[PDB]
Amino acid sequence: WFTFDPNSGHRDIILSNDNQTATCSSYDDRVVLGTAAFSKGVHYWELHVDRYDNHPDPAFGVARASVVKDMMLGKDDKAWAMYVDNNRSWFMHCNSHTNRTEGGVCKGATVGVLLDLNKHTLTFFINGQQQGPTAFSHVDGVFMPALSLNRNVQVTLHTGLEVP
C-alpha cells in the first residue's frame, strides 16, 4: 500500500482524495512520487485515468528519489517510464525512446506498472493487457513509484494489488 508523496512532488502537482489522486496546475509535465521505496520482491500497482483531455503524454513508471521533477518522466537518467497519449505509448529513459506501441489511454483507462526486482524487470499494462514487451531489464537498486502529468490529466492510484 502507498499513496502519492506530497513532499516528493513538484509544487504544481495537486493531490486529493487522501493523496490517492493527482493532477497538475501546469500545461508542462510535473513529477510526483509514491510513498514506497522498493528494493526487493515483485510489486504491481495501477493508475486509473480519471480525466484525459486534449492530447497530453502522461508518464508512468519508477524513479530514483533524485529524478528531475519539472520534466516528463524518463527525460533524465533517473526514471524509467512509459508515456502514453490517446493513440500510442513509448518507453523512455535518459531522453531515449524505445518500443513505440499502438494503443493508448483515455478517460476510464487503467495503467498497470509491474516492478519485478526478482527478475529485475519493469513491465507496463493498459486495461489489464501487457503494453509492449518487457520495457526495461537488468533494473537494479531502489525505486519509487513515479508519475508525470499536466493539467489535462488526473489519475487515481490503486495499490495493494496482487501481481498478475
Author numbering: 609 to 772
Reported in the publication:
The tripartite motif (TRIM) proteins form one of the largest subfamilies of RING-type E3 ubiquitin ligases, comprising more than 80 members. TRIM family members typically contain a RING domain usually catalyzing ubiquitin transfer; one or two B-box domains mediating protein–protein interactions; and a large coiled-coil domain region, which is involved in self-association or oligomerization with other TRIM E3-ligase proteins. About two-thirds of human TRIM proteins feature a PRYSPRY domain, also known as the B30.2 domain, in their C-terminal region. All characterized family members shared the same overall PRYSPRY twisted β-sandwich fold consisting of a 7-stranded and a 6-stranded antiparallel β-sheet.
There are significant variations in the length, conformation, and amino acid composition of the loops connecting the β-strands. For example, we observed a unique 11-residue deletion between β-strands 2 and 3 in the phylogenetically more closely related family members TRIM9 and TRIM67. Compared with the recently determined structures of TRIM7 PRYSPRY with a peptide substrate or a peptidomimetic ligand, the putative substrate-binding site in the structure of the two phylogenetically closely related family members TRIM9 and TRIM67 was much shallower. This was largely, but not only, due to a distinct orientation of the β5/β6 loop. In TRIM9, this methionine, Met608, packs against Tyr619 on β-strand 6. The equivalent interacting residues in TRIM67 exemplifying this loop collapse are Met680 and Tyr691. That this was seen in both the TRIM9 and TRIM67 structures suggests it is an intrinsic property of this loop in these two closely related homologs, rather than being induced by crystal packing. In summary, our structural data provide a platform for future drug discovery efforts but, importantly, also hint at significant challenges in developing potent small-molecule binders targeting the canonical binding site, especially in cases of particularly shallow surfaces and those partly or largely occluded by either loop collapse (TRIM9/67) or dimerization (TRIM36).
